[PDB]
Write a protein that binds this ligand. Structure first.
Ligand SMILES: CCS(=O)(=O)c1ccc(OC)c(NC(=O)N2CCC[C@H](C(N)=O)C2)c1
Ligand SMILES: [Zn+2]
Length: 139
């Protein structure tokens, strides 16, 4: 679990969105596993606007942060789950690191701010949904 709070927006994994997120829907994209809902309280998180390929992510299944080197956002094949059929997920960044399904939502950050959230994983792999291209999160 986990979310990003910036301005009047809450960014979460689309597969973990609540009834309240869908009732206050701003934008969603199944192909990216992202959903953004509106909030009444002001968020203070900062979104990175950069091309960093190194950062630190929070891993809840270890209660620890880990440094990662990650690939540029791209279309990557993701095996079927109870949430989605087998498909290509877009804007996904892959890295070597520990992750379990419940780690989705953990923030990945670089020196410029929030880069994305955990969205997929594998055997010694962790994948992050990028949010740096969503310029409207700041206006
Ligand atoms: C044996 C567990 S594992 O295959 O290593 C593993 C580690 C980590 C994992 O998530 C961090 C997973 N689960 C997933 O990647 N997904 C399930 C939830 C929806 C995700 C999506 N964006 O489509 C895909 C499996
Ligand atoms: Zn950066």
């Amino acid at each position: 679990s986990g979310a990003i709070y910036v301005g009047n927006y809450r960014v979460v994994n689309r597969h973990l969105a609540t009834h309240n997120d869908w009732a206050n829907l701003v934008w969603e994209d199944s192909s990216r596993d992202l959903l953004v809902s509106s909030t009444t309280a002001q968020g203070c998180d900062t979104i990175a606007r950069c091309d960093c390929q190194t950062g630190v992510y929070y891993c809840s299944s270890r209660r620890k942060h880990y440094p990662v080197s990650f690939s540029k956002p791209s279309l990557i094949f993701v095996e079927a789950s109870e949430y989605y059929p087998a498909r290509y997920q877009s804007h996904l960044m892959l890295a070597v690191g520990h992750s379990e399904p419940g780690d989705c939502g953990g923030i990945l950050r670089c020196q410029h701010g929030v880069v994305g959230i955990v969205s997929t994983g594998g055997n010694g792999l962790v994948g992050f949904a990028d949010v740096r291209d969503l310029l409207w999160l700041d206006e």
